[PDB]
Design a protein around this motif. Structure first.
Motif, short mmCIF file in Angstrom:
data_model
loop_
_atom_site.label_atom_id
_atom_site.label_comp_id
_atom_site.label_asym_id
_atom_site.label_seq_id
_atom_site.Cartn_x
_atom_site.Cartn_y
_atom_site.Cartn_z
N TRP A 38 0.83 -1.19 0.00
CA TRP A 38 0.00 0.00 0.00
C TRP A 38 0.86 1.24 0.00
N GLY A 39 0.54 2.16 -0.89
CA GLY A 39 1.37 3.33 -1.02
C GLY A 39 0.66 4.64 -1.20
N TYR A 40 1.43 5.69 -1.47
CA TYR A 40 0.94 7.05 -1.56
C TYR A 40 0.85 7.41 -3.03
N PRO A 41 -0.32 7.34 -3.65
CA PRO A 41 -0.38 7.42 -5.11
C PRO A 41 -0.30 8.84 -5.63
N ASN A 42 0.31 8.97 -6.80
CA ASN A 42 0.35 10.22 -7.53
C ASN A 42 -1.01 10.56 -8.12
N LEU A 43 -1.12 11.80 -8.60
CA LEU A 43 -2.32 12.20 -9.31
C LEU A 43 -2.44 11.44 -10.61
N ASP A 73 7.99 -7.38 -1.40
CA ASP A 73 6.93 -6.63 -2.01
C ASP A 73 5.79 -6.27 -1.07
N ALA A 74 5.58 -7.01 0.01
CA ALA A 74 4.50 -6.68 0.91
C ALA A 74 4.86 -5.47 1.76
N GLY A 75 3.85 -4.89 2.38
CA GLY A 75 4.12 -3.85 3.35
C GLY A 75 3.79 -2.45 2.86
N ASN A 76 4.68 -1.52 3.20
CA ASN A 76 4.45 -0.11 2.95
C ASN A 76 5.56 0.41 2.06
N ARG A 77 5.40 0.24 0.76
CA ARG A 77 6.09 1.10 -0.19
C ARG A 77 5.52 2.48 0.02
N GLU A 78 6.35 3.50 0.17
CA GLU A 78 5.69 4.75 0.49
C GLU A 78 5.24 5.48 -0.77
N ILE A 113 4.58 2.92 -4.79
CA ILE A 113 3.41 2.30 -5.38
C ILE A 113 3.16 2.90 -6.76
N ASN A 114 3.77 4.03 -7.05
CA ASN A 114 3.63 4.66 -8.34
C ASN A 114 4.57 4.07 -9.37
N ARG A 115 5.37 3.09 -8.98
CA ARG A 115 6.06 2.27 -9.96
C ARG A 115 5.42 0.90 -10.06
N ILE A 125 1.63 0.52 -9.70
CA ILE A 125 0.36 0.74 -10.39
C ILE A 125 0.57 0.81 -11.89
N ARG A 126 1.68 1.43 -12.33
CA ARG A 126 1.95 1.65 -13.75
C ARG A 126 2.09 0.36 -14.52
N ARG A 127 2.56 -0.69 -13.87
CA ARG A 127 2.68 -1.98 -14.50
C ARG A 127 1.65 -2.98 -14.00
N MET A 128 0.77 -2.60 -13.08
CA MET A 128 -0.38 -3.44 -12.80
C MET A 128 -1.68 -2.93 -13.40
N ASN A 129 -1.67 -1.84 -14.15
CA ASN A 129 -2.82 -1.61 -15.02
C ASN A 129 -2.42 -1.06 -16.40
#
Ligand SMILES: [Mg+2]
Ligand SMILES: [Mg+2]
Ligand SMILES: [Mg+2]
Ligand SMILES: [Mg+2]
Ligand SMILES: [Mg+2]
Ligand SMILES: [Mg+2]
Ligand SMILES: [Mg+2]
Ligand SMILES: [Mg+2]
Ligand SMILES: [Mg+2]
Ligand SMILES: [Mg+2]
Ligand SMILES: [Mg+2]
Ligand SMILES: [Mg+2]
Ligand SMILES: [Mg+2]
Ligand SMILES: [Mg+2]
Ligand SMILES: [Mg+2]
Ligand SMILES: [Mg+2]
Ligand SMILES: [Mg+2]
Ligand SMILES: [Mg+2]
Ligand SMILES: [Mg+2]
Ligand SMILES: [Mg+2]
Ligand SMILES: [Mg+2]
Ligand SMILES: [Mg+2]
Ligand SMILES: [Mg+2]
Ligand SMILES: [Mg+2]
Ligand SMILES: [Mg+2]
Ligand SMILES: [Mg+2]
Ligand SMILES: [Mg+2]
Ligand SMILES: [Mg+2]
Ligand SMILES: [Mg+2]
Ligand SMILES: [Mg+2]
Ligand SMILES: [Mg+2]
Ligand SMILES: [Mg+2]
Ligand SMILES: [Mg+2]
Ligand SMILES: [Mg+2]
Ligand SMILES: [Mg+2]
Ligand SMILES: [Mg+2]
Ligand SMILES: [Mg+2]
Ligand SMILES: [Mg+2]
Ligand SMILES: [Mg+2]
Ligand SMILES: [Mg+2]
Ligand SMILES: [Mg+2]
Ligand SMILES: [Mg+2]
Ligand SMILES: [Mg+2]
Ligand SMILES: [Mg+2]
Ligand SMILES: [Mg+2]
Ligand SMILES: [Mg+2]
Ligand SMILES: [Mg+2]
Ligand SMILES: [Mg+2]
Ligand SMILES: [Mg+2]
Ligand SMILES: [Mg+2]
Ligand SMILES: [Mg+2]
Ligand SMILES: [Zn+2]
Lengths: 103, 53, 148, 187, 159
Positions: free
Chosen positions: C42-47, C132-137, C140-142, C144-148
Motif C-alpha cells: 500500500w502506497g501514496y499514489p500520484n495524481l 513486495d508486501a508492506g508499505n512502499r511509500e 506504489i507509483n512504480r 500501479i503503472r505496471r499493474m494496469n
RNA sequence: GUCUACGGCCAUACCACCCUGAACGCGCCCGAUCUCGUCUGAUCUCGGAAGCUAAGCAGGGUCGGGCCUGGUUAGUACUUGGAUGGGAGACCGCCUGGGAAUACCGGGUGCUGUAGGCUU
RNA sequence: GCUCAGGGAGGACAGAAACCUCCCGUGGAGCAGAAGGGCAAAAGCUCGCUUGAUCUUGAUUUUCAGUACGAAUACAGACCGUGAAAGCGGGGCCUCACGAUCCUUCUGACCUUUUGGGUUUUAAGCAGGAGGUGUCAGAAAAGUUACCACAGGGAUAACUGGCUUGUGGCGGCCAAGCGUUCAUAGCGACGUCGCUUUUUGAUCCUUCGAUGUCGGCUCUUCCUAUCAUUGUGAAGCAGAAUUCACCAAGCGUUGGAUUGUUCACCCACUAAUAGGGAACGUGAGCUGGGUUUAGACCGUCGUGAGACAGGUUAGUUUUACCCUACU
RNA sequence: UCAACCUAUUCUCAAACUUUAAAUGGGUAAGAAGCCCGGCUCGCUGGUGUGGAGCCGGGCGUGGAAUGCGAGUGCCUAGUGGGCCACUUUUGGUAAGCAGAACUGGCGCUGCGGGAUGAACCGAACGCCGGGUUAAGGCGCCCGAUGCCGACGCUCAUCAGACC
RNA sequence: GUCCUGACGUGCGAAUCGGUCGUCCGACCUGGGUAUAGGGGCGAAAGACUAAUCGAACCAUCUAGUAGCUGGUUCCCUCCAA
RNA sequence: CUAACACGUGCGCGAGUCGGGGGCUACGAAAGCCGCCGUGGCGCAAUGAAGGUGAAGGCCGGCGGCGCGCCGCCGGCCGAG
C-alpha cells in the motif's frame, strides 16, 4: 453427634414456635397388606423364582439420622421428621460438653 | 432410537400378525349377497313388513 | 488466512488476489492496514496514478451491480447528492480527500488489476527487506503503472 | 479465487405459486402486471400474498374483520383478505362491510349480504381500485394454528410452556417424573 | 481432568492486593445503584457472602435489580457458541461503576450544550469524533546548530 | 494559624529518637456513695477539679528505616505478526509493531468533608 | 470482652521446659480436616443467652444440553433467637462431605377416592422427609476351556521391516594418574561428544478373508569395526615373540565330545580357528530335536473344571504344469 | 580460638513462591429504547408532595468514531460423534514418522504450478476456451527459460559442494 | 497297525500301498438274529463311537432366529455442503 | 409394502369436518344417493391425583358502616385491554 431431646422450634399446626420432645425416627414394621407388597407377593407366587431385583452392592455405611419432633403443648401434639446431615455415632441429650478441664 | 421431537408410541405389532389379517376385499360382494338375500326374504313373506315385527 | 486478517481484508474490500482499493489514512485505518500488512502493498499514489486507476479500471457500484463508468451520468445519478457530477470531480474528491470520500470510495468498485508485468521481487516478505508486501511509500507509483 | 461464502447465496422466497390452480394463476397473471407497472406497494404485497401457502395465509374470521374495520378512521374503506373470510358465529349484528377475498365461505357470504354488504373478488378489486387505494389489507392470525404450541423451547426445560406430543391426554400420560416435585424433579 | 469446583483456579483472582488486606473501606458500601447503571465486577475475598463466579471477574453488565445488600446484574457470558445475557446476584462490594458510560454522558451533555448554543449563532461545529489524523505540514526550526550525528557504538563483550 | 466530635481516601499518615506547645480543647489526674464490674476502682462504669505538659496527642527535626512518586537500568529482557533468514542442533539475527523490573540516584512526608470552639 | 505464634528481661524451691509480671510482637498463631484464599476492638480465644440446623412459594448461579441431583447466592411471607441498638442469623468464613423412577416406612389436614347408598376398619391418593443404588444420571451376577466355536479387528498383542537409541556394542576429545624415570610406547579417572541397528527395550504405521512363527544341514552373495596372509608406519621393537596403527575383504577362517540349542565350555590340528548382514537369509529346500493343539505321568497352586517363560513321553510338515528369475 | 548466634554484605534459584509486571488478549460503551422539561399514581421507602419505580403530556435530528455490508426470525432435517499434519506455546518421555493439550491454518472432502519422487510443505483453490501477465520455483543438457561478451569474492576435496 | 515321521499327497484311495512290525488257544477272530436313541445310548475311559456327521447325531419346522460386527447397495446435470 | 406419529406442501368445506361401517338404486367389486343413517372420530375448553370447578370490568343514583372515600345490594349508562 449430640442432639438435645428438646428443641424449641416451629410448630406447623399452632403456627408458632413451641417446644418439642425430640426423639429418633425408626422404621415401622412393613405391612403385609400394602399394595406393592401384596403385588410383589402375588408376582412371586408361582414359578420364575425371584422376580424383582435383590440389591446386593450395599456401599455406604451411614444413614441420615431423622429426628421426630413432637409438640409439647398438650392438645396440639403435631409431629415432623427433621433429618440432618449423616453421622456414624449419634445420641440424644447426653453429656453437654464443657471447656477447660482435665482429662 | 427416537429422534428430536415427536410422540413416543406403542404400536401393537410385536405379535406375528401377517398370518391373521382380515382383508375386506369382499365388502361389495358381501353387500350384494346380503341385499339379494333381503330381497328374497322380502318377497317370500309377501304382504308382511320386510323389517319384521 | 488467519481469521483476523481475513476479516480486516473483508472490510478493506480486498477479496481476490491483486485487487486494489483507495483508503484514507487515520489512526484506525493505519492499524487496520498493519494487521493485514504481510498481505498487502500500500502506497501514496500520484495524481497520475489516481487518473490511470479511474479511467483505466474504474467501475461503479450502481444498484449493487458493477457498471463500467462509461459516461458522466452514471457518476452523477449516484453521487449528485454529494455534489460531484463527473469523473473529474470524482478524481478531485478522491485525490484531495473530501468530505464525502467515504461514499465516493464506496461507490467505486474494488479495482481489479492484472498481475504485475516484469514481476514482483519477492511476495512473502516486506518491502524493507527486499520484497513486495508492506508499505512502499511513494513506490506504489512504480507498481500501479505496471499493474494496469 | 474469491473468499465469498456461498451459504446464503440463494434467496429462498417464492416466485410463483406452488398451486396448479388456474384461477389463482390468472390472478397472479394480473397482479404481476399491476405490481410491475404501478408504483403502489399494495400490489406487491398482494401478489406476495397470492403466492403464499395456505398455512401462511390463514383464514381471517369475520369477528376480526368487524373489529379491525370498526377501528376509528377507516369507515367506508375496502377490507382485503387474501385468505378465506370465514363466519364467526359468536357475533350478532354485522355492519355494512365492503370486503375482498379469494374465497368467502357460504354462511359468511349470506351474513354479509343480509347485512347489506358486498363481496368482491380480486379481478373486481383491480378494476375498482388499481393502485389499491381505499383499501385496508388484513391477514388472518398466522400463529393461531395449534401446531405452534409444540414449538420453541422444549418441554422438560425450565420456563418452557410448550405442549408436548402425547398420544392421549390423561392421568398416566406423562404427568409423573418431569412434572411433579415429589416424583423426581420439577423442571 | 480438572476439578469443577466453584472457586477452582482463583488463587490470584479473589485475593486482595498486596498491603490492602483488612477492613473493606466504607465508600464501596455507601455508593448507590439505580437500575440500568452500568457496573463492573471485581470479586473480593474479604467477604464470602454473595460471591460472583470466576467466569464474571472483570466482566461488565447492567443492573436489573437492586436489593438490600446486593444488586442483580445482567452480564454477557459466552458459552461454547452462543452469548447468554444472564442474570446474576452480586453483593454490593464486588462492584464498581463503569466510567465508560460516564465519559459518554459527559460527551453527550457537551454535544447538547454546544448544539443548543451555536444554533442561534449560525456556525457549524463538529460533533463526530474523527480519529487522529495524519500530521499536517510543519516547519522544523533548527535554530543555530547542526543536528547531532549518530553512529552505532562498536560491540564490546561486557559480560 | 490551630483543636475537638464525626469522618472519607487509608503510610506523602507508619516506626525509632529528640525539641517545642500561648488560648480553647483532648488528656493525664483526685476519688468509689450511688450505676456498674473486677483477685485488684489497673480496665469498664460512676462522682469530680487539687495539680501537670511528664506522657498521650499536636507541630517540627534526622546527609534516618519505610512509604509515595520520578530518573537510571533500557528501547535492555520479553513480545503480536513475517520470511524458501542463519545454525547440524541448541538458539540467534532481521523486518513490522507494543514494551517491563531490581540494584543505583533525585523529589515528597498527609490532603480534606460536615458540625462546633480557640487565637478577648 | 480480650489478643495470637515467637522472642527479650525479671521472679522461692523452678531447671531447657509448671506459674506470675513487664516490653517488643502485621499474623510469623488459630479458624475440625487436604491445600488455596480470607481474617486483629475478627472469622481467632473466653464468657452470657440460645435453637435462622425451623415453616413456605418463586427467581438466579454453579457442571450444563444452558437438563436433573448436590451445593450455593440475593430476595419475599410468617414464627423466633440475640443485642441497648443499628443489625446480624433461614447451618458450619469460602471452595468437597453425596443419590432418580418403582417399592416400603413415618409425618400432615375435622382433606380426596374406596365405585348403587350410608357408617366403620383397611387400602389407594396428595405433599414433605427416610431406607440406595460408591460402576456414584442409578442391572440383581462366579469360574474354566489345551475339546472349543461364531461375528469381526491389523482400532489391538506375539514375527520381520520402519522413526528413536535408553540399555547393549563400538569410537573419539580434554589430561588427574598407572607405565621405576615420563601425561599420551601402551593405557586413562572425574567429565564429555558421537556412530551402528548383529542385543534388548520403546512405539503399534503396514499385515488378523493368515507374510508358515526356534535351531541345524545345504548354498550363493555382501560389509569391515581385520584373526591370518601381501605391503607399511610405532614400540618400554636386541633376537624370537607380542602389542598399537594404515592401505585392505582378494583368499581363508576347520574337525569333534555335551546340549533341541542360538549361546556356552572342553579336547585336537592350525596360518588363523575374527565379527556380522541379506523378512533376526534360507520349511512349495530338507529335517521336526524344541517349543506351539488334542492322549498321558510328576511337583506346586486351585474345593473344582483345570493353570504353570516348571520337567518329561508320543504326536499328518500339503501343491508347480503358470509368469519372472537362473541353469 | 572453634562454634552456633547477631548485624550489614555477597553467589545461585522456584510449575505447585512473590513486592513489581509487560506484549497478546477478555468485557462494557461510542444516543431517538437518548436527553430535557411539565404532571399524576403507589398498599414499597419515608423528618420532608422524601427516595425510587411506573404511567401520562410536550420539546429536542449535526442519526453523534473509522471501515465494510441488505437483515431478523420460525419449522423439519440427513450425515457426523475412529481423526491426522504444520509455524509458535507446551505436558510425559533420553527419544521417536510416540502419546497428550492450546491458538490458527491445512489434510481428510482438493484439484493445478513448484518441492525429481510424495494426503499435510511453498504458491494457489477449479465451469469450457483464445490472448497477455505473474506467484512459488527455475533457466548447461534431460527441460520452456541466461547462447547476459552479467558484477564482486571464497573454495581443491585420494569422501568436494549444490536450496524450507 | 510300530517305524521309515517311506510311497501317494488335485492319490488307486474324502486314510490307500511297500518293507519293517504286534498277537496268533484265549480277556481270540468273525457272519447272521436281537437289544440299547440324542441331552439319550454305549464306552478295558480316548470325550471315543453313535452310517465319511460327535465336548452332544441326522431330518423337517419355528425361521427370512437376532447382530452395536464385515461384504454389497443400480441413470445424468445443477446448487449448497460437513 | 402395511400401521402409527410429526412437520412441510397442494385440494374441498370451514367452527365445523368425514360416511371409511350400513342401507337404497360388459367395463361396474366402479359410480351416485342417504341426513331423523353424524351414531361416532377429531375439533370447538382447560385444570385437578380426586371430590370438582370451569376462561373483562367500570361509571352514575338510593338505602371511615364507622374513625362494609370505600362502598353490601339494587335501577340506568359505557360497554371486552
Ligand atoms: Mg409355591
Ligand atoms: Mg438419526
Ligand atoms: Mg515478458
Ligand atoms: Mg473463478
Ligand atoms: Mg461450495
Ligand atoms: Mg443455503
Ligand atoms: Mg483511678
Ligand atoms: Mg503532654
Ligand atoms: Mg513533651
Ligand atoms: Mg528515608
Ligand atoms: Mg479539620
Ligand atoms: Mg493580646
Ligand atoms: Mg465480636
Ligand atoms: Mg426473614
Ligand atoms: Mg366396593
Ligand atoms: Mg488338558
Ligand atoms: Mg523386531
Ligand atoms: Mg551407550
Ligand atoms: Mg608419575
Ligand atoms: Mg496398527
Ligand atoms: Mg493378506
Ligand atoms: Mg511365501
Ligand atoms: Mg579400514
Ligand atoms: Mg556334529
Ligand atoms: Mg529366518
Ligand atoms: Mg513345509
Ligand atoms: Mg521359500
Ligand atoms: Mg518334536
Ligand atoms: Mg499336549
Ligand atoms: Mg490340592
Ligand atoms: Mg512335462
Ligand atoms: Mg439420511
Ligand atoms: Mg507461511
Ligand atoms: Mg500427537
Ligand atoms: Mg472444506
Ligand atoms: Mg489442497
Ligand atoms: Mg526432494
Ligand atoms: Mg493462458
Ligand atoms: Mg528444473
Ligand atoms: Mg499309529
Ligand atoms: Mg509320511
Ligand atoms: Mg507329487
Ligand atoms: Mg494304476
Ligand atoms: Mg507269539
Ligand atoms: Mg432311557
Ligand atoms: Mg472295547
Ligand atoms: Mg480330553
Ligand atoms: Mg448342545
Ligand atoms: Mg435380512
Ligand atoms: Mg460395539
Ligand atoms: Mg399441513
Ligand atoms: Zn403444636
Amino acid at each position: 453427634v449430640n442432639v438435645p431431646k428438646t428443641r424449641r422450634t416451629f410448630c406447623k399446626k399452632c403456627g408458632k414456635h413451641q417446644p418439642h420432645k425430640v426423639t429418633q425416627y425408626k422404621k415401622g414394621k412393613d405391612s403385609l397388606y400394602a399394595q406393592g407388597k401384596r403385588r410383589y407377593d402375588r408376582k412371586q407366587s408361582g414359578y420364575g423364582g425371584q422376580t424383582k431385583p435383590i440389591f446386593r452392592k450395599k456401599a455406604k455405611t451411614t444413614k441420615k439420622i431423622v429426628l421426630r419432633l413432637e409438640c409439647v403443648e398438650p392438645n396440639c401434639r403435631s409431629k415432623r421428621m427433621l433429618a440432618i446431615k449423616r453421622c456414624k455415632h449419634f445420641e440424644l441429650g447426653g453429656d453437654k460438653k464443657r471447656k477447660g478441664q482435665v482429662i | 432410537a427416537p429422534s428430536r421431537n415427536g410422540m413416543i408410541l406403542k404400536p401393537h405389532f410385536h405379535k406375528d400378525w401377517q398370518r391373521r389379517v382380515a382383508t375386506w376385499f369382499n365388502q361389495p360382494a358381501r353387500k350384494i349377497r346380503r341385499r339379494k338375500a333381503r330381497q328374497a326374504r322380502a318377497r317370500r313373506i309377501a304382504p308382511r313388513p320386510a323389517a319384521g315385527p | 488466512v488467519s481469521p483476523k486478517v481475513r476479516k480486516v481484508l473483508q472490510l478493506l474490500r480486498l477479496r481476490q488476489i491483486f485487487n486494489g482499493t483507495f483508503v484514507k489514512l487515520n489512526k484506525a485505518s493505519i492499524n487496520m492496514l498493519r494487521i493485514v500488512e504481510p498481505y498487502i502493498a500500500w502506497g501514496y499514489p500520484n495524481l497520475k496514478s489516481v487518473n490511470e486507476l479511474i479511467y483505466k479500471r474504474g467501475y461503479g457500484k450502481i444498484n449493487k451491480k458493477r457498471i463500467a463508468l462509461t459516461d458522466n451520468t452514471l457518476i452523477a445519478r449516484s453521487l449528485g447528492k454529494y455534489n460531484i457530477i463527473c469523473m473529474e470531480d470524482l478524481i478531485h474528491e478522491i485525490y484531495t480527500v473530501g468530505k464525502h470520500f467515504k461514499e465516493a470510495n464506496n461507490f467505486l468498485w474494488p479495482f481489479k488489476l492484472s498481475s504485475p508485468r516484469g514481476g514482483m521481487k519477492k511476495k512473502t516478505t516486506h518491502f524493507v527487506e527486499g520484497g513486495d508486501a508492506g508499505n512502499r511509500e511513494d513506490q506504489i507509483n512504480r507498481l500501479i503503472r505496471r499493474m494496469n | 479465487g474469491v473468499d465469498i461464502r456461498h451459504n446464503k447465496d440463494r434467496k429462498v422466497r417464492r416466485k410463483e405459486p406452488k398451486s396448479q390452480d388456474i384461477y389463482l394463476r390468472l390472478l397472479v397473471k394480473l397482479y404481476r402486471f399491476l405490481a410491475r407497472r404501478t408504483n403502489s406497494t399494495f400490489n406487491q404485497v398482494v401478489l406476495k400474498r397470492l403466492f403464499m401457502s395456505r398455512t401462511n395465509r390463514p383464514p381471517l374470521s369475520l369477528s376480526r374483520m368487524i373489529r379491525k374495520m370498526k377501528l376509528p378512521g377507516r369507515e367506508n374503506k375496502t377490507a382485503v383478505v387474501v385468505g378465506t373470510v370465514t363466519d364467526d358465529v359468536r357475533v350478532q349484528e354485522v355492519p355494512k362491510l365492503k370486503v375482498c377475498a379469494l374465497r368467502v365461505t357460504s354462511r359468511a357470504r349470506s351474513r354479509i349480504l343480509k347485512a347489506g354488504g358486498k363481496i368482491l373478488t380480486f379481478d373486481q378489486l383491480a378494476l375498482d381500485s388499481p393502485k389499491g387505494r381505499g383499501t385496508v389489507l388484513l391477514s388472518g392470525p398466522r400463529k393461531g394454528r395449534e401446531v405452534y404450541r409444540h414449538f420453541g423451547k422444549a418441554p422438560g426445560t425450565p420456563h418452557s410452556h410448550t405442549k408436548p406430543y402425547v398420544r392421549s391426554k390423561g392421568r398416566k400420560f406423562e404427568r409423573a417424573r418431569g412434572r411433579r416435585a415429589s416424583r423426581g424433579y420439577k423442571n | 481432568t480438572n476439578t469443577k469446583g466453584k472457586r477452582r483456579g482463583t488463587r490470584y483472582m479473589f485475593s486482595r492486593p498486596f498491603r490492602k488486606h483488612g477492613v473493606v473501606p466504607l465508600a464501596t458500601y455507601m455508593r448507590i445503584y439505580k437500575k440500568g447503571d452500568i457496573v463492573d465486577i471485581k470479586g473480593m475475598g474479604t467477604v464470602q457472602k454473595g460471591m460472583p463466579h470466576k467466569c464474571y471477574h472483570g466482566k461488565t453488565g447492567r443492573v436489573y435489580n437492586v436489593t438490600q445488600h446486593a444488586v442483580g446484574i445482567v452480564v454477557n457470558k459466552q458459552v461454547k457458541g452462543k452469548i447468554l445475557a444472564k442474570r446474576i446476584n452480586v453483593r454490593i462490594e464486588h462492584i464498581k461503576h463503569s466510567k465508560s458510560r460516564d465519559s459518554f454522558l459527559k460527551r453527550v451533555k457537551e454535544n447538547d450544550q454546544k448544539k443548543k448554543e451555536a444554533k442561534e449563532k449560525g456556525t457549524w461545529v463538529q460533533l463526530k469524533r474523527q480519529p487522529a489524523p495524519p500530521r499536517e505540514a510543519h516547519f522544523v526550526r533548527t535554530n543555530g546548530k547542526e543536528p547531532e550525528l549518530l553512529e552505532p557504538i562498536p560491540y564490546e563483550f561486557m559480560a
